[PDB]
Structure 1
Amino acid sequence: MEAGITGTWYNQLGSTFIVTAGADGALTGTYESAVGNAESRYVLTGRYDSAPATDGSGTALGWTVAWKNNYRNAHSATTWSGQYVGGAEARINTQWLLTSGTTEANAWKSTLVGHDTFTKVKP
């Protein structure tokens, strides 16, 4: 189990990540790049190290969001890979890969890469 992961996280763009960390190492929740906007809400699932080293190392984790809900389908999926770092300034530092479904000829532009930092405090 990883105590301080469960809860609401905000990236620097305004997006909200709401997650529950299961004792089993399961991450379950929703991602919304808007303010309680249902059309901007998507389901996420992931995994985290439920028994991290005690030496001050961070807690490795990862999650995926397929960009399809009841209002839209962007034919793409993003995976965030990173680690949770506890403390008064808790944060989840990540790197992401956004892949779009493409034809074979267009596969060269299928994957974008970037990074996000989530904190527990509003934007």
Structure 2
Amino acid sequence: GITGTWYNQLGSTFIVTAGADGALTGTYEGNAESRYVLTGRYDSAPATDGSGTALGWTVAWKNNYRNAHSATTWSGQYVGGAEARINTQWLLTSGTTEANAWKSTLVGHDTFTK
């Protein structure tokens, strides 16, 4: 299922483990200074009708090495089978002063392959 190593369109790598508790843990990454801790949740008892499995996770972009004062959340679903995929939409927020709060959040989409 979801546990394993996933790659997106643009080279990022995420190694995740799905607990039976609905917990998601892993890293978004190779080299230490590019690795960040992730945490999230997923639906551990999805519908049995062909629907995907809902899930979400967060990465705060601060590690031992660097800090971009920002965090990304990904919301999407796992679709299993032949080529398993995770289709997501994401929000990136940066810490801003009150003056720039209007432009603090980027939106995008990502697809991961196992």
TM-score by length of 2: 0.98
Q: Deviations over 1:43-68 (max 9, x none)?
A: 00000000000101000000000000
Gaps of at least 5 residues in structure 1 are none
SS in 2 for 1:67: strand
Distance 1:92 1:23 in 2: 19
Q: Deviations over 1:69-116 (max 9, x none)?
A: 000000000000000000011000000000000000010110000000
SS in 1 for 2:33: helix
SS in 2 for 1:76: strand
Distance 2:104 2:32 in 1: 27
Gaps of at least 5 residues in structure 2 are none
TM-score by length of 1: 0.91
Whether 1:40 and 2:34 are equivalent positions in the alignment is yes
Q: How many percent of aligned residue pairs carry the same amino acid?
A: 100
1:12 CA displacement: 0.5
SS in 2 for 1:53: coil
SS in 2 for 1:93: strand
Distance 2:54 2:19 in 1: 14
Distance 1:56 1:17 in 2: 25
1:9 CA displacement: 0.2
Distance 1:54 1:79 in 2: 27
CA root-mean-square deviation: 0.3
Distance 1:8 1:86 in 2: 14
